[PDB]
């Protein structure tokens with residue numbers, strides 16, 4: 729383990745996660761950054777192939793365990809349904825710098841999407857804070873004349889509607905350790921802090937893009953009404969799937985794949 733990883737786990741146990749995330753963001757300021765016009769680039773990962781004209785481009789999350797592997801299950805369920813590629817968030821692996829703004833990351837990822845897709849249509853998807861990153865990427869793409877056909881936001885908690893995420897921060901942190909299939913090293917933990925700060929200060933812009941909100945079917949803890957659910961401030965359609973914030977996209981990834989297929993044309997709209 730490492731001091732940072734042990735500290736994170738103790739932040740969960742002791743109810744001081746917000747404090748610890750603010751520390752990790754502070755520390756991140758001492759790492760190398762990129763600003764979008766210094767020559768940094770990245771590539772997309774090919775995850776599955778499928779029929780049709782529309783690729784599902786999935787953006788990695790911002791958790792310290794996040795990465796293109798978070799979509800292995802979803803991509804397996806979409807194999808033979810639609811092509812699937814994944815966008816990494818830069819700075820979670822060795823040798824990669826961190827973005828100095830949302831605009832920086834969105835620019836390098838949009839470069840990669842355009843280089844890989846050409847004029848082949850696509851939708852952008854992400855989960856949790858990765859859904860904020862996905863929408864920012866979709867926005868960038870639209871502002872460059874390659875809009876996506878739509879955006880899939882999986883269990884998104886936007887700025888100003890994060891009350892359940894805040895109530896559950898300890899539970900979330902303990903669950904991340906129970907589901908640590910990629911080790912939380914110090915590169916990942918400082919990248920967590922950096923992206924948590926970026927996404928917390930950002931605000932989405934209205935785009936008019938078709939949007940599918942995919943919600944967990946149950947809360948990670950007891951709630952008095954339905955105000956614990958993910959939400960989105962702009963026009964969207966909504967579906968729910970089995971599972972909670974974590975299991976919905978892993979154990980129940982097939983349910984997600986089914987709604988994506990219907991939304992891409994496999995229902996009756």
Ligand SMILES: [Ca+2]
Nearest residue numbers: 763764765766
């Ligand atoms: Ca510069």
Ligand SMILES: [Ca+2]
Nearest residue numbers: 822913914915
């Ligand atoms: Ca490392």
Ligand SMILES: [Ca+2]
Nearest residue numbers: 809989993994
């Ligand atoms: Ca289909």
